[PDB]
Symmetry: C6
Subunit: 68 residues, 6 copies
């Protein structure tokens, strides 16, 4: 397939779907996708928006499946 | 050889073959390949479709060998 | 989205916002973003400015959210 | 030197030489190289052909040295 | 910012500043930067000059801050 | 500096200098550099020539410093 990453991330963003982001260091982040670009995902929780490098993301697990 | 990754992934996709995806952080995911693009594999289980970054995948082990 | 990484880093830089940088090896660095370029972030604490490779950064957590 | 990776992999492939592939996550795979492309090696054992991402391979140790 | 990595490394080199290089595998190297190129840093201690791949470097901590 | 990686590797190769190659997974390999290309180093010991991916190498420590 082609050009699926961004539809996925935009669907999480627009639909405000809670996600679990599992990093290569074993940390698991939880929040909403606020925005993203070529290299980063901005992830918002109750406290803060943090900047996550995609290269460090293993998998993004949403609370529910999204339509792309 | 040349251009084998996508035939493999498409064969898993079309044939609905259960896979084990072993990530660089030691997590092992199980499900079916729903779709994929340059950078990601969308992996479906009973619960959810998650987005897996290829850069974090070490090996994809199918339940049976596939024809490319 | 597009071109968000640098606005984020520049906002941390200009606003002098303390950050926690979580590396792929589990080290957590704390300080202020002094500068950055394509590949590195220069992070200043009480003692020193160190050069952090972006490829080794998992997430940058600011003490407060920033305006991009 | 130049253009050695593929001669090595093709020699393992054509000669059917058993290999140990050591991944960045510490897993050690054993089998024969079935095929390979820019990004992946297809590794066959008694049970299955699995798809191994080169980016996750640290070293490929053959049971015997190969002629390139 | 732009083009900061090399000024940093050259300043360590020219000024002979002792550094701690923290690798993604947790090893910490100590010595002086002898030279560097696109991909590597040559690090000298009492015993030897070793070749360190930048892709494996998380952070370079100097004994004192440098002028770029 | 510029174009140092290959002079280093070729000097180890031509001079037959024993090396320790430290991989990102913590494995330490020992032998002589037999050859190398853009992506791999072929490392020979008493038993075998193995193919090491540069992306998995953290540092190459020679038994003695080499002239580039």
């Amino acid at each position: 397939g082609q050009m699926l990453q961004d539809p996925f991330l935009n669907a999480l963003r627009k639909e405000h779907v809670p996600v679990s982001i599992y990093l290569v260091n074993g940390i698991k982040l939880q929040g909403q996708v606020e925005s993203f670009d070529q290299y980063v995902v901005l992830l918002r929780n109750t406290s803060v928006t943090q900047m996550v490098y995609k290269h460090a993301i293993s998998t993004i697990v949403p609370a529910r499946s999204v339509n792309l």
